[PDB]
Design goal:
part of a larger assembly, 5 chains, 145 residues, mainly beta, 4-stranded antiparallel beta sheet, binds a molecule of 3 linked components (NAG-NAG-NAG), binds a molecule of 2 linked components (NAG-NAG), binds 2-acetamido-2-deoxy-beta-D-glucopyranose, Spike glycoprotein (chain B)
C-alpha cells in the first residue's frame, strides 16, 4: 500500500504538499508500481508536465507479508432509479407476475427495482414511454409502463 | 480480455497538413445559453413526469454562456477537378481542456443556411452538420517540445460512415514512429481525414476515420470497442458527456427527443479511472474544390452543478427552463417552484 | 468462531434461514465464547 | 464491476468466499440478497 | 393603549438552518419543500 504520495515544489525543492484522494477515486501514485512493491518502504520519483502542474511527484510504498489464504476486501454499493433495468437474485418467475386481473386491489409491487404499495388501474398513456415510471412532484409513483 | 484491432495501419508516414489557427479563430457566430429555449438539458434519469413544474439539481450549463466554438474546414486541393492534396486544420489537437464535471455540445446549429467556405473566402454554399471527435484521458505527456499526447489509457470517440456510425473505444494510444508522425521528426498535428469519394458516394466505409486515426497511433492492448448507428439527417441536435462512479455516460437528443432537443442517455461505458482532460480532434474533409462545402460549427458548453426549474409537458418533454441562480427574478421563480 | 459474521442480525448466509434466528422481542445478548481445555463439555466430531 | 440488467446466483457466492466481517451503512446483506436493485457496484481488492 | 400591529419579521430558511456551511446546505436540498412553506407562510402573514 502507498504510505506517502506528495508533490515537491520550490526552487530548492523544499515544499511538500501531501496529495489526498476523494471517495471512490484512484491515486496519482497508483502508476508508480501498479502490481506491487518489490521492497518495503520503496521510494519512487517522477516528473510532472506543465499541464498537470509540474514538479517532482514522490511516492513511497509499504509491503506486508502474504498470508496462507488470500484475503480480500469488497465494497458493495446499491443505486436506485439509475435506469429501467434491474439487478436481481436468480429466482423463478412468480405466479404473481401479472396484474391484468387484480386491478383495483392494494398490492405490494416490486417493479424493475422500484418498490412500494399501491392500486393499479387502466389509464391513457402520459409521459415518456421510454422510461417506464411516471412520478409526481413529491417523488411518488403515479404511472407505470 | 482485450478486443483485437487486427487491421493495423501499414502506412509509411502520416499525412502532411497545414495548420492555420488564425483563419478559424476569426469566425464567430455566438450562441449564448438560453434556458427559455431548452438548451443542453439532461432529462432526469429513470423517471419521467407529465404536466408539472419542479426544481431539479443536477449538471446544467450556465445561463448566458458563450461556450467554445469549433469549426471543421475543407482540404487543400490543387486543380479544379484535382484530388485533395493536404489537410487544412486548426490547432485543436494541441490544446488541452478540463473535463471537471462534463460537457454538452450544440451540433448542427447553422444547418439549412448559407455561409462562406473557410478555405475559399469567395465561395458561399449551404452548410452541413459536422459531428465532433473527442479524446478524453487522465494523464498527459509531450513528444519533446510540449505538444500534448495522452498517456496510458484514453477514451476515443469518433464519428464515421459519413456521419452514420459512432465509435467509442477505451484503449492505449502508442505514438507511431513514422515520418512526421507524433513519434517522428516534424509533428505538426494529429487529425482524422477521409476521402468523400471512397465512402460517401459508394458503399459507406464505416472505418475511414478510424483508419486515419490508426496512422497516428497504435491501439495497444485496448480493452473495449463499442459502436452505435446514427440515422442521417440535417436536424440540429445536442450531445453530452458525463462521468460518475458507474463510468462514463453518453447522452444524445437523437435517442428519444429528436425535435425537442432534450438529451437522453444511451450508453454507460466502463471507464472508472476518472477523466480529467479532453481534446477535440480536427476533422478535415477531403474532396475537389468545386464539391467543397462548409460544415457547421459545434459549441462545447461546460457543465456545472446547478439547480433549474423544469416544466414538463403532458407528453413528458421539457419546454421551459429557468436557471435558478442567474438573477433575482429567477431565484424568486424557483423559490415558489412555479 | 470463524463464522461469527454469519450469526449477526442481518447476515446473508444460511444460519438465519435454516439454523437459528434470534428474536428481539426482549432484551438480549449474543455471546460467543471458548470452552477452556479442562472444562467438561464433550466436543462433537465437527460442526454442522 | 458495475452490474445492471442481470441475475446473480447466491448459492455460488455463499461458497466462493468465507466472510470475516460485515459492516453495512444504509442497507443490510439480506436486502441485497432478497431485493432487486437498479444497479450494483462492487469495488474489490486484496487486503490483509 | 390599544395594539394595532406586531413587528413584521421574515426568515431565510436556508440561512437560519445552515449558517453558510456548504456541507449543511447540500443535505438541506433533500428538504426545501419545508422551507418554501415557511417562506410562503411568513410572506402571507406580513402581507395581511
Ligand atoms: C433543416 O432542414 C431539415 C430538412 O431539410 C428539417 O428536417 C425536418 O424537420 C421537421 C421538424 O422541424 C420534421 O417534421 C417532423 O416530421 C415527422 C414526420 O411525420 C413528424 O412526426 C414530426 O412531428 C415533425 N416535427 C414536428 C415538430 O412536428 C421533418 O420531417 C424534417 N424533415 C427532414 C427531411 O428531415 C429541419 O427541421 C431543418 N431545421 C434544422 C434546424 O435542422
Ligand atoms: C473496422 O475495424 C474494426 C476494428 O475495431 C474491425 O473489427 C475487428 O476486425 C478484425 C479484422 O477482421 C477482427 O479480427 C476483429 O474480431 C474485429 N473486432 C470485433 C470486436 O469483432 C471491423 O471488422 C472493421 N470493419 C471493416 C468493414 O473493415
Ligand atoms: C517536454 O518533455 C521533456 C522530456 O520529455 C521535458 O524535459 C525538458 O525538455 C526541454 C526541451 O523540451 C529541455 O530543454 C530540458 O532540458 C528537459 N528537462 C530535463 C530535466 O531533461 C520538458 O520539460 C517537457 N516540456 C517542455 C515544454 O519541453
Ligand atoms: C492555438 O490557436 C489559437 C488561435 O490563434 C492561439 O490563441 C493559441 O495560442 C494556439 N495554441 C497553440 C498551442 O498553438
Ligand atoms: C395541466 O396542468 C394544469 C395546471 O393546473 C391544468 O390546468 C391542466 O388541466 C392540466 N392538463 C393539461 C392537459 O393541460
Ligand atoms: C503510462 O505511460 C508512461 C509514458 O512513459 C509510462 O512511463 C508509464 O509507465 C505508463 N503507465 C503504466 C501504468 O504503464
Ligand atoms: C499489454 O499486455 C501485455 C500482456 O498482458 C503486457 O505485457 C504489455 O505490457 C501491455 N501493454 C502495455 C503498453 O503495458
Ligand atoms: C444455487 O446455486 C446452484 C448452483 O449449484 C443452483 O443450481 C441453484 O439454482 C441456486 N439456487 C436457486 C434458488 O436458484
Amino acid at each position: 500500500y502507498i504510505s506517502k504520495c506528495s508533490r515537491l515544489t520550490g526552487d530548492y525543492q523544499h515544499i511538500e504538499t501531501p496529495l489526498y484522494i476523494n471517495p471512490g477515486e484512484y491515486s496519482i501514485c497508483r502508476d508508480f508500481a501498479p502490481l506491487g512493491f518489490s521492497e518495503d518502504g520503496q521510494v519512487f520519483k517522477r516528473t510532472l508536465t506543465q499541464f498537470e502542474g509540474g514538479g517532482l511527484l514522490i511516492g513511497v510504498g509499504t509491503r506486508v507479508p502474504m498470508t496462507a489464504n488470500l484475503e480480500m476486501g469488497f465494497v458493495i454499493s446499491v443505486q436506485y432509479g439509475a435506469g429501467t433495468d434491474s439487478v436481481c437474485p436468480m429466482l423463478d418467475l412468480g405466479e404473481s407476475s401479472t396484474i391484468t386481473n387484480r386491478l383495483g386491489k392494494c398490492v405490494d409491487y416490486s417493479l424493475y427495482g422500484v418498490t412500494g404499495r399501491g392500486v393499479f388501474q387502466n389509464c391513457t398513456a402520459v409521459g415518456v414511454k421510454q422510461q417506464r415510471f411516471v412520478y409526481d412532484s413529491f417523488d411518488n409513483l403515479v404511472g407505470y409502463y | 480480455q482485450f478486443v483485437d484491432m487486427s487491421p493495423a495501419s501499414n502506412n509509411s508516414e502520416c499525412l502532411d497538413s497545414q495548420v492555420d489557427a488564425a483563419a478559424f479563430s476569426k469566425l464567430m457566430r455566438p450562441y449564448p445559453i438560453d434556458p427559455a429555449k431548452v438548451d443542453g438539458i439532461i432529462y432526469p434519469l429513470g423517471r419521467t413526469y407529465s404536466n408539472i413544474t419542479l426544481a431539479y439539481t443536477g449538471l446544467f450549463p450556465l445561463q448566458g454562456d458563450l461556450g467554445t466554438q469549433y469549426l471543421y474546414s475543407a482540404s487543400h486541393a490543387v486543380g479544379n477537378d484535382g484530388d485533395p492534396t493536404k489537410a487544412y486544420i486548426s490547432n485543436y489537437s494541441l490544446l488541452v481542456n478540463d473535463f471537471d464535471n462534463g460537457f454538452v455540445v450544440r451540433v448542427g446549429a447553422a444547418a439549412n443556411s448559407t455561409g462562406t467556405i473557410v478555405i475559399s473566402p469567395s465561395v458561399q454554399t449551404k452548410i452541413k452538420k459536422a459531428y465532433p471527435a473527442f479524446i478524453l484521458g487522465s494523464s498527459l505527456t509531450n513528444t519533446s517540445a510540449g505538444q500534448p499526447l495522452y498517456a496510458n489509457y484514453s477514451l476515443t470517440i469518433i464519428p464515421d460512415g459519413c456521419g452514420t456510425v459512432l465509435h467509442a473505444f477505451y484503449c492505449i494510444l502508442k505514438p507511431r514512429t513514422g515520418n512526421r508522425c507524433p513519434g517522428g521528426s516534424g509533428y505538426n498535428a494529429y487529425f482524422i481525414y477521409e476521402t468523400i469519394h471512397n465512402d460517401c458516394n459508394s458503399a459507406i466505409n464505416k472505418n475511414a476515420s478510424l483508419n486515419s486515426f490508426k496512422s497516428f497511433f497504435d491501439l495497444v492492448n485496448c480493452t473495449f470497442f463499442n459502436s452505435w448507428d446514427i440515422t442521417a439527417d440535417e436536424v440540429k441536435e445536442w450531445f453530452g458527456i458525463t462521468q460518475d462512479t458507474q463510468g462514463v455516460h453518453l447522452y444524445s437528443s437523437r435517442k428519444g427527443d429528436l425535435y425537442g432537443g432534450n438529451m437522453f442517455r444511451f450508453a454507460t461505458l466502463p471507464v472508472y479511472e476518472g477523466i480529467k482532460y479532453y481534446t477535440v480532434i480536427p476533422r478535415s474533409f477531403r474532396s475537389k474544390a468545386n464539391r467543397r462545402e462548409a460544415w457547421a460549427a459545434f459549441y462545447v458548453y461546460k457543465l456545472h452543478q446547478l439547480t433549474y426549474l423544469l416544466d414538463f409537458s403532458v407528453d413528458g418533454y421539457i419546454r421551459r427552463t429557468i436557471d435558478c441562480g442567474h438573477d433575482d427574478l429567477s431565484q424568486l421563480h424557483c423559490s415558489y417552484t412555479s | 468462531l470463524s463464522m461469527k459474521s454469519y450469526i449477526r442480525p442481518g447476515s446473508a448466509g444460511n444460519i438465519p434461514l435454516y439454523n437459528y434466528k434470534q428474536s428481539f422481542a426482549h432484551p438480549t445478548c449474543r455471546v460467543l465464547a471458548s470452552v477452556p481445555p479442562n472444562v467438561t463439555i464433550t466436543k462433537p466430531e465437527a460442526y454442522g | 464491476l458495475v452490474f445492471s440488467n442481470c441475475n446473480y446466483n447466491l448459492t455460488k457466492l455463499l461458497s466462493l468466499f468465507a466472510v470475516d466481517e460485515f459492516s453495512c451503512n444504509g442497507i443490510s446483506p439480506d436486502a441485497i440478497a432478497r431485493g432487486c436493485y437498479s444497479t450494483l457496484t462492487v469495488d474489490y481488492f486484496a487486503y490483509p | 393603549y390599544i395594539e394595532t400591529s406586531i413587528q413584521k419579521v421574515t426568515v431565510d430558511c436556508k440561512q437560519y438552518v445552515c449558517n453558510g456551511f456548504t456541507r449543511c446546505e447540500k443535505l438541506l436540498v433533500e428538504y426545501g419543500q419545508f422551507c418554501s412553506k415557511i417562506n410562503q407562510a411568513l410572506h402571507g402573514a406580513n402581507l395581511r
